[PDB]
Write a protein that binds this ligand. Structure first.
Ligand code: ADP
Lengths: 238, 243, 234, 204, 231, 220, 199, 99, 250
């Protein structure tokens, strides 16, 4: 309990508890799933509402024309990092007149988020990201943790009850690389669906989809723009 | 510099340093104020009459401008700081704006200053409460009060310091449109209220009054004795000749 | 024991932010209703004495001519955010020659969310979160909008929302009576009704404050008489 | 010139066990006189005077900051200042603004508060100190004062002869300088007393 | 990366004591003893420079240090801290000399040094110095002997002792010493009061002596100390 | 101003004149231009007077610290380093021209230091308005490994050349002789100049100056 | 260009100033006031650069008022004068110097009436009478001619009229009207304007 | 307890300890009852005025007052006196309070 | 860092600042120092704790600091902190002089130092100054003055008061003996010797144990003088010869 309250304190067993507790903040967020073909990168996110008379939290954010993100955790830290990423992208376009490669943006986020895990009284960023992007090396889905670690994923899911989605995605990886966009978004929607009890299901009110690709700037669909994707699914029955 | 959070939230959602500050206020000499028509009176209780003491050097009623006076209860040093800052701001208002200072404005300044000290690293809340009293241009008389939290409100009459609940009850029951119909009657009301907490004297009551565009007037203990005398007389010509 | 203001709980939460949320539960309750005819905001004043001039209680303020704000909790902390909001709206008008969208103002105020911390910061930076909940009620190009904000910095659009001590009760009551086609009259009426239900003192003209923003009319705080005309129809 | 903007003249002179410091009294802006009683000589202790000519603003400001430092010195240590030490203190103060200097050329005159041995000195605008056993001058009529003091000054003078000497020197030097004069004031200081006199001078 | 702790480590106890200062004083009263005598025509400082082995070269470090040409220093307590204070005292002395072109008065150097010591009882993140200083000086004909302690307080002495057994040394001084003493006799009684503790054979390399007359401060050579220790 | 410096077999002879001028008037007739730096290091100063005074005081201070700390004698290289770095840092805005000389563990050493921060180590140097006269004297009558009295004579001769051929120089001649174990701060060496005796007595008699006002203040 | 003038009597200070606010070749204002109350017994007459006069004067004013609110008694005209002179002198070598010429008139209950003259270089000089402006060159001598230290305030006003009439006759600048104030034991009194009814 | 800041909340909580009562340190009236009560049961010089004592100390509690009452007793018993005077209380006040 | 922070600038749950209170306790254990105002002057008289056979006496005093040509102060508590505060007082007074070219009014000097002490109580995390002061002075506004300040930065004016060990006894004695409007330097000196004689633990009282300073007004100048040991012995003898006189009456 004396190794619990500070990020600068290694535990006698080789761990840092504030980082792990910070990582637990990612599981508190509604689930989100991200998968790629060979040409497209798709984020699908289960939005989420406090009361029925409140709108749903937005979960996919636009960074640059070629990069969008899905958030899971503290929304304030999310917006912090999001502003940083947008600024870096604009700096890149300003100085080089070329879009910033996704892997470099991610590296910058790693650098930025590593710093407060090493200084006293600083706290790690309480937010996990899925980053969907397209550059000269194709589509990309990246994952960032509060530990400031990042991973290049072929598909991924984070948030509460995202283990299910992780399993489903782990089954259908072999299909994804050749899927068409509609099928890709479908797979993402199914992955997202397995993260719910049989009582509740997908709607045009609690689902956001985000696509970026070789012939498509990053775009967010929600409300009625999602309906053409959903109305095309197998009513998975218990 | 020292960058440590002193005032933070408690698990029940309270700011404990602010509460202890308010305790410090609760240990203060009693101060009350009532608002009249053409007079506003503030009176402060125990002057700690040590008799070998210069009263002038321990007054708890200061003037912020020709327009606004103020009383306080709590930690005298913190009060001195807040008072001086408020004075500076009262003047800088006249620099930046040819119009003078309104009591609400300076109240707002003081309030914000205290709140700032409740939410800055390193700092500790000022442990005072203030009764800000004045007459604004347009002639409406005004009395506001602040708190170590930074909250502020207007009052018709109020009390702060040791036994503020008692005086407040009394003032609740005795503030009428009949009382404070004359200056002599508002002052009388304040002396009546202050005698209900004070150590029973009259040499232990300071009363200051402000009226129209005239300056602050502090009462010498002769006049105070006279008022407490008419008080005791009416307390024996309308309370003796009845019961 | 003493931990920092920037500590996580093993459950994944900043204790300061949670504690602040707790601190809201002590504030006076407030109700906001969004409607295609405008947005209404009501709050109880909670006067602690007949001696206290109730007109010096403003838990409803104008951020700008088309954006109003109702606050619950530590009012002193609210003042800072309100000022920052006003300045922000005016800077956006200054720079771009157009009013701020309610969502943009809301976001701006919400950026001062988790901006607290001890070491590695300015000597005049915040020591703790803001112990206040806000309801921003405005009108813009998307029409009438209402947002809610808490010390977590999460802000969210709401159709009808209650903040304060009687948040739960009033919110349930709101759910029972809200539909996306009410008139502003029905909204105000409903608000005053629920408010009367939850208020400890008897509801009257100098006991709550009420304000509307309609598309054609700037932010309007209801006078005593205008309140009386509504309370009459109990 | 900047130094000629206000004009003015200050002289100090050694005697036997005595010392003298004089100055004109004009405060003038270029050709025009504004006042005839302007102070140029400041007491920095009993039996220690500093004489400031030059630009009147820096006269006043150097005098004032010098009094600042001096008061502090006399409080920290339990003694009046020695003249050497005052000289070095002034020098320091002037050199602090080496690249935007005060336009004053001070003259110090005073008796060692332990002994009685007279001390006189002068400094640059940037505080180069210069001690003599005869006299020191500063101002717009420096040449004149040098000319008179080289021809009038004898070594071991008694207070009356120091007086006559410094008075005639100041008067005749100053009366051939357009922007100095409007009166002369002369402080002759000895172990036992301090005599201050104002001479009859031309007012043109 | 690094900053500085900003809070005081020296704080009032409920009794009203600055505990860290008294514990620093405990560190002083655990160091080798030093005696200082002001003697009409000069000042004597002496201290026990007793090493722990034939291996240590006694001609390498000294405990009696000059601050200027007319002021000298000895200490009791922790060595390193003394070193720091001596550097700082030399610096202060030279500041004063730059400004007044007159060697710093002993009282003023004592004041300044004491101020430095007091800073580390109120500035953040530090402990007080574990050193008592004896400062001798010649200024204005008279001789001067001051002591400064870790609190930053200073006292003028005719004679005193610091370090281990400083109480008995102090009493011995109160009895077996008085005014009208020449520097020679003062050196004598200084070595005499140091001998009231020096467990072992007091050699010319076991103790260090400094004098301060109206010819300047100086350390006595080992030869001179041998000649004096022939008594 | 005429300052000169020479290296002889056992050490160093510095020389200077004593006039300080403000414009084309002599302001000081007995200015001291040879500054104490350390017991074994002395420095003649020409150029901006204030700057040579304060430069040389600063350096004296830091070197006193340095010897106090080292427990040894300062080296002349140390003074040269300190001066030349400080001077370069100020880009010649500090008008110090110096002749720095002394005796070390390594022997005698004479540097000339120019305001921009350049130095030269030389057997004989001159600086100031009278420097080229003195340099002529050196270039005509200098030989290596001179003895003390010869070097004193040579230096005084160069300073004299300066005095009589430069209007910026005048009055007396000051010498400073520094050897491995002696320091002769002769001041003044030889005054080749005297004010002529006053032929007349312009003595003013008491009361000859008119007074308006008097004020006696008794002291103690 | 601006005119100021001050005449100290045995127990009063008379001050007078032109009322023209001018720009380019035109008078834009003819009822402009050059004077500033600092205390109940102190007047500050400021003249000079466009922005510096009011900025400086108002700064000084606020600081004097602050002293009064902080200490309960008012500053003496001498303390005030040295205060303004310190502030003016500190800014002289700074990035933001103040080109102001000033008079400071006042009355102390102890030391009596006082008149201070300040150049824009911030040099402080006590005088029985002074003036600022080009007009001063034509008026000072008149004062020298007709000022006596025992002058009554009636005679003072008359003398002032002499100066102002001289201005009317010789000076090329217009200057038709003059604010006239007098400070004594009882405070600041406004006297009727000295004017020369041109048009 | 005198200091309630050093009690475990578990003991203070209600259930365990409900009513929490404070004991203020007289003032000017209570003391009168305290003084009158302590000097009313003895040969207290009807000359002096308990007031002098009441307005004497700064914040003296209900003890100090009793000590002064008793002090005189010993004073009384000292110089052999059945009826204390003034100084007796004075010496007491200065003998107890001060010291 | 959160661990080692003693938190000095923080409220206690009853509403008090612990370090300030404790500092007052520190003050209680310092040398007694008292001050009496009169109509023709004002005086400070203090117990000397530096009373040992080997002390050399190189300063004009021990507990009486001269701050300004019109004004002087005495101290009680930690002496080094007193050196700090006295230095700063000097600076303040000389700054006022540089700004206004006239001496600083005593109240403003006291307030100026008290704002420093208060500052130390409110922020920074440093310990407060364990020092109380008495200030004596004169100014052209309120004439002779006596003030007192505590480590909370809180100050007040008195006609007579005491500070340090056995302060309260001394205060009570002064409440008995003082003479509003009827005080002289002579009478006040008597009172000083009396109260000092009773409050000092070591009775009989030698001049080696006390330090007396008076501040008086002579011909437009302000004089501050520390009484030579001879005059002090005269005062003491006078006290005993008055005390043996009132004991005859029985
Ligand atoms: N007002 C009072 N009335 C009666 N007795 C008192 C009063 N004040 C003090 N005492 C006496 O002094 C003693 C104080 O004891 P107590 O009140 O228990 O103090 P504590 O709680 O500190 O021990 C009691 O025994 C009581 O007899």
């Amino acid at each position: 309990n004396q190794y619990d309250n500070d990020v600068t304190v290694w535990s006698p067993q080789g761990r840092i508890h504030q980082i792990e507790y910070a990582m637990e903040a990612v599981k508190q967020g509604s689930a989100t799933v991200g998968l790629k073909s060979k040409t497209h990168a798709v984020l699908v996110a289960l939005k989420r509402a406090q009361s029925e008379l409140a709108a749903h939290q937005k979960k996919i954010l636009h960074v640059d024309n070629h990069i969008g993100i899905s958030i899971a955790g503290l929304t304030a830290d999310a917006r912090l990092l999001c502003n940083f990423m947008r600024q870096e992208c604009l700096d890149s376009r300003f100085v080089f007149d070329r879009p910033l490669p996704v892997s470099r943006l991610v590296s910058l986020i790693g650098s930025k988020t590593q710093i407060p895990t090493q200084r006293y009284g600083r706290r790690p960023y309480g937010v996990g990201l899925l980053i969907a992007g397209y550059d000269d090396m194709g589509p990309h889905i990246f994952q960032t943790c509060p530990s400031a670690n990042y991973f290049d994923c072929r598909a991924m899911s984070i948030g509460a009850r995202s283990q299910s989605a992780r399993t489903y995605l782990e089954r259908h990886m072999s299909e994804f690389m050749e899927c068409n966009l509609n099928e890709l978004v479908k797979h993402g929607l199914r992955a997202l669906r397995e993260t719910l009890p049989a009582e509740q299901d997908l709607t045009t009110k609690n689902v956001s989809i985000g696509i970026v690709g070789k012939d498509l700037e990053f775009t967010i669909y929600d409300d009625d723009d999602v309906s053409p994707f959903l109305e095309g699914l197998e009513e998975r029955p218990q | 510099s020292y960058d440590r959070a002193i005032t933070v939230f408690s698990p029940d959602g309270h700011l404990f340093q602010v509460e202890y500050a308010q305790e410090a206020v609760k240990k203060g000499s009693t101060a009350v104020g009532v608002r009249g028509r053409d007079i506003v009176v503030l009176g402060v209780e125990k002057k700690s009459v040590a008799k070998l003491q210069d009263e002038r050097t321990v007054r708890k009623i200061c003037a912020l401008d020709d327009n606004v006076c103020m009383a306080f209860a709590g930690l005298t040093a913190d009060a001195r700081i807040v008072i001086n800052r408020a004075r500076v701001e009262c003047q800088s208002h006249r620099l930046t704006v040819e119009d003078p200072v309104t009591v609400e404005y300076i109240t707002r300044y003081i309030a914000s200053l205290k709140q700032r000290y409740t939410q800055s690293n390193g700092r500790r809340p000022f442990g005072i409460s203030a009764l800000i009293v004045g007459f604004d241009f347009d002639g409406t008389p005004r009395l506001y009060q602040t708190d170590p939290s930074g909250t502020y409100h207007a009052w018709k009459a109020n009390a702060i310091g040791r036994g503020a609940k008692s005086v407040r009850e009394f003032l609740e029951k005795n503030y009428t449109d009949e009382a404070i119909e004359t200056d002599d009657l508002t002052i009388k009301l304040v002396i009546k209220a202050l005698l209900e907490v004070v150590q029973s004297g009259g040499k232990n009551i300071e009363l200051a009054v402000m009226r129209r565009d005239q300056s602050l007037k502090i009462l010498n203990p002769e006049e105070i004795e006279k008022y407490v005398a008419e008080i005791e007389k009416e307390k024996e010509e309308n309370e003796k000749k009845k019961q | 024991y003493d931990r920092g203001v920037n500590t996580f709980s093993p459950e994944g939460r900043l204790f300061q932010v949670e504690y602040a949320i707790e601190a809201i539960k002590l504030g006076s309750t407030a109700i906001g209703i969004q409607t295609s005819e405008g947005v209404c905001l009501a709050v109880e004043k909670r006067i602690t004495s007949p001696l206290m001039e109730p007109s010096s209680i403003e838990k409803i303020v104008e951020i700008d001519a088309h954006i109003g704000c109702a606050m619950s909790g530590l009012i002193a902390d609210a003042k800072t955010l309100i000022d920052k909001a006003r300045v922000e709206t005016q800077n956006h008008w200054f720079t771009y020659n157009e009013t701020m969208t309610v969502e943009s103002v809301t976001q701006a105020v919400s950026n001062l969310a988790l901006q607290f911390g001890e070491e590695d910061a300015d000597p005049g930076a915040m020591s703790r979160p803001f112990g206040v909940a806000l309801l921003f009620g405005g009108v813009d190009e998307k029409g009438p909008q209402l947002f809610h904000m808490d010390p977590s910095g999460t802000f969210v659009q709401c159709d009808a929302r209650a903040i304060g001590s009687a948040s739960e009760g009033a919110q349930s009551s709101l759910q029972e009576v809200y539909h996306k086609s009410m008139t502003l009259k029905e909204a105000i009426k409903s608000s005053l009704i629920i408010l009367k239900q939850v208020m400890e003192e008897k509801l009257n003209a100098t006991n709550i404050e009420l304000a509307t923003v309609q598309p054609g009319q700037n932010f309007h705080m209801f006078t005593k008489e205008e309140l009386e005309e509504v309370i009459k129809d109990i | 010139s900047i130094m000629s903007y206000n004009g003015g003249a200050v002289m100090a002179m050694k005697g036997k066990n005595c010392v003298a410091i004089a100055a004109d009294r004009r405060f003038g802006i270029q050709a025009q006189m504004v006042t005839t009683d302007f102070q140029k000589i400041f007491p920095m202790g009993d039996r220690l005077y500093i004489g400031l000519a030059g630009l009147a603003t820096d006269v006043q400001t150097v005098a004032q900051r010098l009094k600042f430092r001096l008061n502090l010195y006399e409080l920290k240590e339990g003694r009046q200042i020695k003249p050497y030490t005052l000289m070095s203190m002034v020098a320091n103060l002037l050199y602090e603004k080496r690249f935007g200097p005060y336009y004053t050329e001070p003259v110090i005159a005073g008796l060692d508060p332990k002994t009685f041995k007279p001390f006189i000195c002068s400094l640059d605008l940037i505080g180069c100190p210069m001690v003599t056993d005869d006299f020191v001058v500063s101002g717009t009529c420096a040449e004149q004062m040098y000319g008179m003091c080289e021809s009038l000054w004898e070594p071991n003078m008694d207070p009356d002869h120091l007086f006559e000497t410094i008075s005639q020197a100041m008067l005749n030097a100053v009366d051939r300088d357009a922007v100095s004069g409007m009166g002369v004031i002369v402080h002759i200081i000895e172990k036992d007393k301090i005599t201050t006199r104002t001479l009859k001078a031309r007012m043109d | 990366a690094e900053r500085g702790y900003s809070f005081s480590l020296t704080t009032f106890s409920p009794s009203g004591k600055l505990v860290q200062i008294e514990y620093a004083l405990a560190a002083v009263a655990g160091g080798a003893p030093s005696v200082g005598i002001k003697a009409a025509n000069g000042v004597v400082l002496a201290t026990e420079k007793k090493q722990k082995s034939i291996l240590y070269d006694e001609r390498s470090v000294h405990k009696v240090e000059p601050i200027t040409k007319h002021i000298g220093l000895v200490y009791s307590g922790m060595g390193p801290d003394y070193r720091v204070l001596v550097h700082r005292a030399r610096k202060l002395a030279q500041q004063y000399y730059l400004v007044y072109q007159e060697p710093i008065p002993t009282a003023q150097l004592v004041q300044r040094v004491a101020s430095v010591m007091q800073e580390y009882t109120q500035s953040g993140g530090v402990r007080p110095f574990g050193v008592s200083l004896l400062i001798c000086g010649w200024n204005e004909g008279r001789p001067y002997l001051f002591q400064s302690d870790p609190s930053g307080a200073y006292f003028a002495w005719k004679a005193t002792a610091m370090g281990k057994n400083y109480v008995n040394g102090k009493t011995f001084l109160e009895k077996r010493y008085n005014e009208d003493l020449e520097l020679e006799d003062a050196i004598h009684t200084a070595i005499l009061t140091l001998k009231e503790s020096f467990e072992g054979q007091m050699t010319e390399d076991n103790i260090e002596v400094g004098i301060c007359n109206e010819a300047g401060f100086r350390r006595l050579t080992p030869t001179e100390v041998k000649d004096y220790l022939a008594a | 101003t005429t300052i000169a410096g020479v290296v002889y077999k056992d050490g160093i002879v510095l020389g200077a004149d004593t006039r300080a001028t403000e414009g084309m008037v002599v302001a000081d007739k007995n200015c001291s231009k040879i500054h104490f730096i350390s017991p074994n290091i002395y420095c003649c100063g020409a150029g901006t007077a204030a700057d040579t005074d304060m430069t040389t005081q600063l350096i004296s201070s830091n070197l006193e610290l340095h010897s106090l700390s080292t427990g040894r004698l300062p080296r002349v290289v140390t003074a040269n380093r300190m001066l030349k770095q400080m001077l370069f840092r100020y880009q010649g805005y500090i008008g110090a021209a110096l002749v720095l000389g002394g005796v070390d563990v390594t022997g005698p050493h004479l540097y000339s230091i120019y305001p921009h921060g350049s130095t030269d180590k030389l057997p004989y140097v001159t600086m100031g308005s009278g420097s080229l006269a003195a340099m002529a004297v050196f270039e005509d009558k200098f030989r290596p490994d001179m003895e003390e009295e010869e070097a004193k004579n040579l230096v005084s001769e160069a300073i004299a050349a300066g005095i009589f051929n430069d209007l910026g120089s005048g009055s007396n001649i000051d010498l400073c002789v520094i050897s491995k174990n002696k320091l002769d701060f002769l001041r003044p060496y030889t005054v080749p100049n005297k004010k002529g005796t006053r032929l007349g007595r312009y003595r003013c008699e008491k009361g000859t100056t008119a007074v308006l006002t008097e004020k006696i203040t008794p002291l103690e | 260009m601006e005119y100021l003038i001050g005449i100290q009597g045995p127990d009063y200070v008379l001050v007078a100033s032109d009322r023209v606010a001018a720009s380019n070749i035109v008078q834009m204002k003819d009822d402009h006031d050059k004077m500033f109350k600092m205390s109940e017994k102190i007047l500050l007459l400021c003249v000079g650069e466009a922005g510096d006069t009011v900025q400086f004067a108002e700064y000084i004013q606020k600081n004097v008022q602050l002293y009064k609110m902080r200490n309960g008694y008012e500053l003496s005209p001498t303390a005030a004068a040295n205060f303004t002179r310190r502030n003016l002198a500190d800014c002289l070598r700074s990035r933001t110097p103040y080109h102001v010429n000033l008079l400071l008139a006042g009355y102390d209950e102890h030391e009596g009436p006082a008149l201070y003259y300040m150049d824009y270089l911030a040099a402080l000089a006590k005088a029985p009478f002074a003036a600022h402006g080009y007009g001063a060159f034509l008026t000072l001598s008149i004062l020298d001619r007709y000022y006596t230290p025992t002058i009554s305030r009636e005679r003072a006003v008359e003398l002032l009229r002499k100066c102002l009439e001289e201005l009317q006759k010789r000076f090329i600048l217009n200057l038709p009207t003059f604010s006239v104030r007098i400070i004594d034991k009882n405070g600041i009194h406004d006297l009727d304007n000295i004017s020369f009814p041109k048009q | 307890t005198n200091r309630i800041e050093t009690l475990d909340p578990a003991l203070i909580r209600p259930g365990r300890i409900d009513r929490k009562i404070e004991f203020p340190l007289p003032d000017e009236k209570t003391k009168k009852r305290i003084f009158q009560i302590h000097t009313s049961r003895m040969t207290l010089a009807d000359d002096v005025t308990l007031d002098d004592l009441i307005m004497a100390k700064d914040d003296l509690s209900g003890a100090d007052i009793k000590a002064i009452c008793t002090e005189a007793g010993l004073m009384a018993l000292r110089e052999r006196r059945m009826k204390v005077t003034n100084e007796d209380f004075k010496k007491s006040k200065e003998n107890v309070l001060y010291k | 860092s959160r661990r080692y922070d003693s938190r000095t600038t923080i409220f206690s749950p009853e509403g008090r600042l612990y370090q300030v209170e404790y500092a007052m306790e520190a003050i209680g254990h310092a040398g007694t120092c008292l001050g009496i105002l009169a109509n023709d002057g004002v005086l400070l008289a203090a117990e000397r704790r530096n009373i040992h056979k080997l002390l050399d006496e190189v300063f004009f005093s021990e507990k009486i600091y001269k701050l300004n040509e019109d004004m002087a102060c005495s101290v009680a508590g930690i002496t080094s902190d007193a050196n700090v505060l006295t230095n700063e007082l000097r600076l303040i007074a000389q700054r006022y002089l540089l700004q206004y070219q006239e001496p600083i009014p005593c109240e403003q000097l006291v307030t100026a130092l008290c704002d420093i002490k208060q500052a130390y109580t409110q922020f920074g995390g440093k310990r407060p100054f364990g020092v109380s002061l008495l200030y004596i002075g004169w100014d052209k506004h309120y004439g002779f003055q006596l003030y007192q300040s505590d480590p909370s930065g809180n100050y007040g004016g008195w006609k007579a008061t005491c500070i340090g060990n056995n302060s309260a006894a001394a205060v009570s004695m002064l409440k008995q003996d003082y003479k509003e409007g009827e005080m002289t330097l002579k009478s006040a000196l008597a009172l000083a010797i009396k109260v000092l004689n009773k409050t000092m633990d070591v009775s009989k009282l030698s001049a080696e144990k006390v330090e007396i300073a008076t501040l008086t007004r002579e011909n437009g100048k302000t004089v501050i003088r520390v009484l030579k040991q001879k005059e002090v012995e005269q005062l003491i003898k006078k006290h005993e010869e008055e005390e043996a006189k009132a004991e005859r009456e029985k």
